[PDB]
Design an enzyme around this catalytic site. Structure first.
Site, PDB file in Angstrom:
ATOM      1  N   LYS A 164       0.821  -1.208   0.000  1.00  0.00           N
ATOM      2  CA  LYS A 164       0.000   0.000   0.000  1.00  0.00           C
ATOM      3  C   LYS A 164       0.858   1.262   0.000  1.00  0.00           C
ATOM      4  O   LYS A 164       0.595   2.205  -0.756  1.00  0.00           O
ATOM      5  CB  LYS A 164      -0.946  -0.015   1.199  1.00  0.00           C
ATOM      6  CG  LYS A 164      -2.098  -0.991   1.046  1.00  0.00           C
ATOM      7  CD  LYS A 164      -2.802  -1.242   2.363  1.00  0.00           C
ATOM      8  CE  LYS A 164      -1.950  -2.089   3.287  1.00  0.00           C
ATOM      9  NZ  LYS A 164      -2.676  -2.438   4.537  1.00  0.00           N
ATOM     10  N   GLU A 190      -3.345   7.356  13.766  1.00  0.00           N
ATOM     11  CA  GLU A 190      -2.567   6.167  13.462  1.00  0.00           C
ATOM     12  C   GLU A 190      -1.257   6.182  14.251  1.00  0.00           C
ATOM     13  O   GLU A 190      -1.028   7.046  15.102  1.00  0.00           O
ATOM     14  CB  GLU A 190      -2.332   6.074  11.956  1.00  0.00           C
ATOM     15  CG  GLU A 190      -3.480   5.419  11.207  1.00  0.00           C
ATOM     16  CD  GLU A 190      -3.877   4.084  11.800  1.00  0.00           C
ATOM     17  OE1 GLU A 190      -3.106   3.114  11.648  1.00  0.00           O
ATOM     18  OE2 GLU A 190      -4.960   4.005  12.417  1.00  0.00           O
ATOM     19  N   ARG A 191      -0.392   5.214  13.965  1.00  0.00           N
ATOM     20  CA  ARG A 191       0.818   5.035  14.754  1.00  0.00           C
ATOM     21  C   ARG A 191       1.857   6.103  14.434  1.00  0.00           C
ATOM     22  O   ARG A 191       2.143   6.394  13.268  1.00  0.00           O
ATOM     23  CB  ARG A 191       1.401   3.648  14.510  1.00  0.00           C
ATOM     24  CG  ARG A 191       0.494   2.519  14.943  1.00  0.00           C
ATOM     25  CD  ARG A 191       1.140   1.181  14.670  1.00  0.00           C
ATOM     26  NE  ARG A 191       0.277   0.070  15.048  1.00  0.00           N
ATOM     27  CZ  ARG A 191      -0.599  -0.504  14.237  1.00  0.00           C
ATOM     28  NH1 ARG A 191      -0.777  -0.074  13.000  1.00  0.00           N
ATOM     29  NH2 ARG A 191      -1.316  -1.531  14.680  1.00  0.00           N
TER      30      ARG A 191
HETATM   31  N1  LIG Z   1       6.541  -2.694  -6.770  1.00  0.00           N
HETATM   32  C1  LIG Z   1       7.324  -3.331  -5.894  1.00  0.00           C
HETATM   33  N2  LIG Z   1       8.561  -3.702  -6.289  1.00  0.00           N
HETATM   34  C2  LIG Z   1       9.350  -4.339  -5.421  1.00  0.00           C
HETATM   35  N3  LIG Z   1       9.095  -4.686  -4.158  1.00  0.00           N
HETATM   36  C3  LIG Z   1       7.865  -4.308  -3.794  1.00  0.00           C
HETATM   37  C4  LIG Z   1       6.937  -3.644  -4.577  1.00  0.00           C
HETATM   38  N4  LIG Z   1       5.768  -3.418  -3.866  1.00  0.00           N
HETATM   39  C5  LIG Z   1       6.015  -3.938  -2.690  1.00  0.00           C
HETATM   40  N5  LIG Z   1       7.261  -4.495  -2.575  1.00  0.00           N
HETATM   41  C6  LIG Z   1       7.830  -5.152  -1.404  1.00  0.00           C
HETATM   42  O1  LIG Z   1       6.810  -5.289  -0.427  1.00  0.00           O
HETATM   43  C7  LIG Z   1       7.179  -4.583   0.777  1.00  0.00           C
HETATM   44  C8  LIG Z   1       5.953  -3.964   1.395  1.00  0.00           C
HETATM   45  O2  LIG Z   1       5.995  -2.544   1.151  1.00  0.00           O
HETATM   46  P1  LIG Z   1       4.936  -1.570   1.798  1.00  0.00           P
HETATM   47  O3  LIG Z   1       5.509  -0.852   2.954  1.00  0.00           O
HETATM   48  O4  LIG Z   1       4.367  -0.682   0.693  1.00  0.00           O
HETATM   49  O5  LIG Z   1       3.779  -2.546   2.244  1.00  0.00           O
HETATM   50  P2  LIG Z   1       2.380  -2.419   2.991  1.00  0.00           P
HETATM   51  O6  LIG Z   1       1.414  -3.436   2.545  1.00  0.00           O
HETATM   52  O7  LIG Z   1       1.925  -0.970   2.843  1.00  0.00           O
HETATM   53  O8  LIG Z   1       2.804  -2.621   4.500  1.00  0.00           O
HETATM   54  P3  LIG Z   1       2.422  -2.092   5.950  1.00  0.00           P
HETATM   55  O9  LIG Z   1       1.090  -2.615   6.364  1.00  0.00           O
HETATM   56  O10 LIG Z   1       3.575  -2.560   6.843  1.00  0.00           O
HETATM   57  O11 LIG Z   1       2.472  -0.568   5.826  1.00  0.00           O
HETATM   58  C9  LIG Z   1       8.246  -3.591   0.334  1.00  0.00           C
HETATM   59  O12 LIG Z   1       9.100  -3.239   1.415  1.00  0.00           O
HETATM   60  C10 LIG Z   1       8.980  -4.377  -0.753  1.00  0.00           C
HETATM   61  O13 LIG Z   1       9.937  -5.276  -0.204  1.00  0.00           O
HETATM   62 MG   LIG Z   2       1.715   1.237   5.080  1.00  0.00          MG
END
Ligand SMILES: Nc1ncnc2c1ncn2[C@@H]1O[C@H](COP(=O)(O)OP(=O)(O)OP(=O)(O)O)[C@@H](O)[C@H]1O
Ligand SMILES: [Mg+2]
Ligand SMILES: Nc1ncnc2c1ncn2[C@@H]1O[C@H](COP(=O)(O)OP(=O)(O)OP(=O)(O)O)[C@@H](O)[C@H]1O
Ligand SMILES: [Mg+2]
Lengths: 470, 478
Positions: A164, A190-191
């Site tokens: 996200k 949020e945090r």
């Molecule tokens: N387009 C991408 N290319 C490469 N790696 C990616 C990509 N999208 C996500 N990732 C991988 O997935 C991980 C998750 O990233 P991100 O912080 O956006 O996740 P999230 O679902 O928002 O997590 P959270 O709930 O912890 O905020 C990244 O750190 C990376 O390792």
């Molecule tokens: Mg996030």
């Protein structure tokens, strides 16, 4: 006169008495400044928001911080206007606290800066745009199966660690690059560590120079948590109203706004509504959401994450919020672990824009055909385990062969994903992605290896990758 | 001086309380200093309770309140046709002021028992899945109920557009809708030309709760003006659930004890008082009529909820739209299991009544057989009755957006389906068959169309079969 005195302090609720004929208007801002005269006092610096007129020249307010140290009789000053935050170019790359005061150490903002009121009626019926328009994000999945609308509200869902944050950063990057607009991020309840992590990630990606951030996190009082969204929105509105740009607005969690409103209502003493929510839930949500609209000279579009209590989509807060949404994008841990990015579910995502009237007959036909192909593959995945791969019919084999390449071609390389992968990003126009998906549907590329479609931009890059591979 | 002047004591959350005004009457309009209007709700012993109909931010304690001498009223007239106004009659589209010269009260008694006549005139909505098996007559009030994103607004817009030929005035009342959505709806109306006879009343989600509470009464009071002149009016309430929510907010702010699901005691009286004014007047009262199409948004299709049951207990039927059907290609989303018209049928043209009378129950039986046949195989006649009839009926009841069909063009294709002329051609071809059959009829059966149009009955006992076969000869499979 324009001076009052405190007469009641009850938690976040403060009552102030003014001279007759000099009461402040509703939603005005009042300042309390005090120096400890002796050892039995403390220094105070506080902001109050007017909420009611109780009569007998008394005004009930809500404090934006802790009310410890207040003494019955302290002087109160009227500012004559609601809370006002700085707007303009100076807000880009800075972090604010709901009062418009910076948090980072880049220094204060000069007193000659323009400031706009927090509270404002929604734009008139005259000023709205007459036609629906599509916001070209440049991401293939979103632009094909779940289009965005200028002035529309988008709900974001997904588990932890799916993408996200990186998706949000890529959206900001693409909008700033192509459409010339900016973004405003407003965290709500949020945090604090998550906010700090997001700040550092934005600084690393280089997106930070084109965005403004307001946080007002979980540890803040309900009065502040209830107005963080409004201050972020009012800094966003300046660029659309005065410069005619296309702007993004990210709200970290819209549910915390409703929860803070309910907490504030309980302190005001109103009668609880159905499930303990405030009686004014719908009105508050309308007053927040109806300001995010496309106008004759610009637009604001908002990406909102919505927490649903107890996974009950019939709860009053999610039910009220969903009535305003125009689209929905869902993330999939299955796709994330499979290696597909940006891991958007191509079947759970829904959008009001995907209609022949708005998007076009060609786009609509291509999208519906893709969805049908993916659904057929989903059905066949059960029969594969029931019977076996070879037992399926030839037409089912062709369907599977098309579906693998479709599902792989939905992926894309992000500009902000370079720090991980080592590969530059790609901005794919909607016409180009429609043409590429039509070509994949028609069987023009059935001979190519399926892994050459894995993570790539336009369709020409796919044949380039296949040429380099074999 | 306290007879015609008052002073505000309290202001908050859209309601106020004023001292003085000894000669005000219950329900009177009062005017604040800012020009924002109000309504006198409660006449207590020493003060008056006022509901503020507008922005209350500019009203402060100690402001002056004055009488207007008028019970709550809205302007009415033919000058209002083609305009977008708020529940107070203020023009909103910006095309200058409104030149009305008459007013009607918001609250008015409904027509009596002896003032009414049985509904006997059809309201042609232009949609097959309605005009065939859930007919609507003039003077009826039919409920449209379903979940969000199901086509409830689209049904009303199509019905309003289809009324261009007929002599009927249309009123579209939007309560709690998004302003962009209202703007787009107005643009579709302008494009299709329905603004020659349409009044649009709007109260968006940003407006205070009293205006949301008040909008439907303004709409029906605007409708009554044409109704009592012997004309025919159609009124569409885009949400009554949001009106109920606004009234609940108002009641809780006024500290009235809540009932079931926090709704006040008279949540039933609100809707009954609103919807009881739709009636079919008799020849002694002039023969005018008013038609109502209230909307109710359910949550996960729970037809047993408090507000849906309250509204069902008032109207003359309901049209149930199912999200499960709306998704996956059944776009009109009609659910024949829960849709019924209690007054309809007696207000249906003879040809359609003669042909499509049994379709509702036959399609319900087909729906049950559809789940029953998933258990395995069945009789030859079972497979016939299922696949030959039901699938073709479902695929022919489907209809595109904003594409009304004249009632004769509906009855032709319905007769062709029910007489077995469609049993042979593939399921995936009947929509093209219908699309080309309309042109074939326009070319070659204009006299049959005139026959139906004039005598309201089938053109002939058998003569139509020759033209049907003549079209089938030039039509091609796939
Ligand atoms: N387009 C991408 N290319 C490469 N790696 C990616 C990509 N999208 C996500 N990732 C991988 O997935 C991980 C998750 O990233 P991100 O912080 O956006 O996740 P999230 O679902 O928002 O997590 P959270 O709930 O912890 O905020 C990244 O750190 C990376 O390792
Ligand atoms: Mg996030
Ligand atoms: N007959 C139809 N053919 C094709 N699309 C249709 C049809 N009827 C409705 N739609 C589509 O359904 C979607 C939602 O329809 P509509 O706005 O009428 O729903 P609603 O129940 O009023 O929604 P809301 O809860 O937003 O008010 C739109 O994308 C519209 O184009
Ligand atoms: Mg609608």
């Amino acid at each position: 006169m324009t001076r009052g005195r405190v007469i009641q302090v009850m938690g976040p609720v403060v009552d102030v008495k003014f001279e007759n004929g000099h009461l402040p208007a509703i939603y005005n801002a009042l300042k309390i400044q005090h120096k400890a005269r002796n050892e039995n006092e403390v220094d105070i610096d506080l902001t109050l928001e007017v909420a009611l007129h109780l009569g007998d020249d008394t005004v009930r307010t809500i404090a934006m911080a802790s009310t410890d140290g207040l003494i019955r009789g302290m002087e109160v000053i009227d500012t004559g206007a609601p809370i006002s935050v700085p707007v303009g170019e100076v807000t880009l790359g800075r972090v604010f606290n709901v009062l418009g005061e910076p948090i980072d150490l880049e220094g204060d903002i000069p007193a000659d800066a323009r400031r706009d009121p927090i509270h404002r009626p929604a734009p008139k019926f005259e000023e709205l745009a007459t036609e629906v328009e599509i916001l070209e994000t440049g991401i293939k999945v979103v632009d094909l199966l779940a289009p965005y609308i200028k002035g529309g509200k988008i709900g974001l869902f997904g588990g932890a660690g799916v993408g996200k944050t990186v998706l949000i950063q890529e959206l900001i990057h693409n909008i700033a690059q192509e459409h010339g607009g900016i973004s405003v991020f407003a965290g709500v309840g949020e945090r604090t560590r998550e906010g700090n992590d997001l700040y550092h990630e934005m600084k690393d990606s280089g997106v930070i120079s084109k965005t403004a951030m307001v946080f007002g996190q979980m540890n803040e009082p309900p009065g502040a948590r209830m107005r963080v969204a409004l201050t972020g929105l009012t800094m966003a509105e300046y660029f659309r109203d005065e410069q005619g740009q296309d702007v993004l607005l990210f709200i970290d969690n819209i549910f915390r706004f409703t929860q803070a409103g309910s907490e504030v209502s309980a302190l005001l003493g109103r009668m609880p509504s159905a499930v303990g929510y405030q009686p004014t839930l719908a009105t508050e949500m309308g007053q927040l959401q109806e300001r995010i609209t496309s106008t004759a000279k610009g637009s604001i579009t908002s990406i909102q994450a919505i927490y649903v209590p107890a996974d009950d989509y019939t709860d009053p807060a999610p039910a009220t919020t969903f009535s305003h949404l125009d689209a929905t994008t869902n993330l999939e841990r299955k796709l994330a672990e499979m290696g597909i990015y940006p891991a958007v579910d191509p079947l759970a995502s829904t959008s009001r824009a995907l209609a022949p009237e708005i998007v076009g007959e060609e786009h609509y036909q291509v999208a519906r055909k893709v969805q049908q192909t993916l659904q057929r593959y989903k059905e066949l995945q059960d029969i594969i385990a029931i019977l076996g791969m070879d037992e399926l019919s030839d037409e089912d084999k062709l369907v599977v062969h098309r579906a693998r390449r479709i599902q792989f071609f939905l992926s894309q390389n992000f500009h902000v994903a370079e720090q991980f992968t080592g590969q530059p990003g790609s901005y794919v126009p909607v016409k180009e992605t429609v043409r590429g998906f039509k070509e994949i549907l028609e069987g023009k590329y059935d001979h190519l290896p399926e892994d050459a479609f894995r993570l790539v931009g336009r369709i020409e890059e796919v044949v380039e990758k296949a040429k380099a591979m074999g | 001086q306290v007879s015609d002047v008052g002073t505000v004591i309290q202001v908050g959350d859209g309601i106020a309380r004023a001292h003085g005004l000894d000669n005000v009457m219950s329900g009177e309009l009062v005017e604040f200093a800012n020009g924002v209007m109000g309504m006198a709700l409660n006449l207590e012993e020493n003060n008056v309770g006022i509901v503020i109909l507008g922005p209350y931010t500019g009203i402060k304690e100690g402001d002056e309140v004055r009488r207007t001498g008028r019970i709550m009223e809205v302007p009415v007239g033919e000058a209002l046709i083609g305009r977008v106004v708020n529940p107070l009659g203020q023009p909103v589209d910006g095309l200058g002021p409104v030149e009305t010269t008459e007013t009607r009260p918001i609250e008015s008694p409904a027509p009596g028992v002896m003032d009414r006549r049985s509904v006997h005139e059809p309201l042609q909505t232009g949609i097959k899945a309605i005009d065939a098996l859930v007919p609507i007559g003039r003077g009826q009030r039919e409920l449209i109920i379903g979940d969000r994103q199901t086509g409830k607004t689209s049904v009303a817009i199509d019905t309003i557009i289809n009324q261009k030929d007929q002599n009927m005035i249309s009123i579209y009342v939007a309560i709690g809708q998004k302003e962009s959505t209202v703007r787009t709806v107005v643009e579709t109306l302008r494009k299709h030309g329905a603004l020659d006879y349409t009044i649009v009343v709007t109260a968006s989600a940003s407006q205070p709760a009293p205006l949301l509470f008040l909008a439907p009464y303004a709409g029906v009071a605007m409708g009554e003006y044409f109704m009592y002149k012997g004309k025919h009016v159609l009124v569409v309430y885009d949400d009554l659930s949001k009106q109920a929510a606004a009234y609940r907010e108002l009641s809780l702010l006024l500290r009235r004890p809540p009932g079931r699901e926090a709704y006040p005691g008279d949540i039933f009286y609100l809707h009954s008082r609103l919807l009881e004014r739709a009636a079919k007047l008799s020849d002694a009262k002039g023969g005018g009529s008013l038609t109502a199409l209230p909307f109710v948004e359910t949550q996960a299709g729970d037809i047993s909820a408090y507000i849906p049951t309250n509204v069902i207990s008032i109207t003359d039927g309901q049209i149930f739209l199912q999200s499960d059907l709306f998704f996956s290609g059944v776009r009109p989303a009609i659910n024949a299991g829960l849709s019924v018209s209690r007054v309809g049928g007696a207000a249906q043209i003879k040809a359609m009544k003669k042909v499509a009378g049994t379709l509702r129950l036959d399609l319900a039986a087909y729906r049950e057989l559809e789940a029953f046949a998933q258990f395995g195989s069945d009789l030859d006649k079972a497979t016939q009755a299922k696949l030959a009839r039901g699938a073709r009926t479902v695929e022919v009841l489907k209809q595109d957006l904003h594409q009304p069909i004249p009632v004769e063009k509906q009855v032709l294709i319905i007769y062709a389906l029910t007489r077995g002329f469609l049993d042979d051609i593939p399921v995936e071809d009947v929509r093209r068959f219908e699309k080309e059959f309309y042109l074939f009829l326009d070319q070659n059966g204009q006299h049959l169309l005139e026959h139906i149009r004039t005598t309201k009955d089938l053109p002939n006992e058998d003569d139509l079969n020759k033209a049907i076969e003549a079209f089938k000869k030039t039509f091609v499979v796939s």
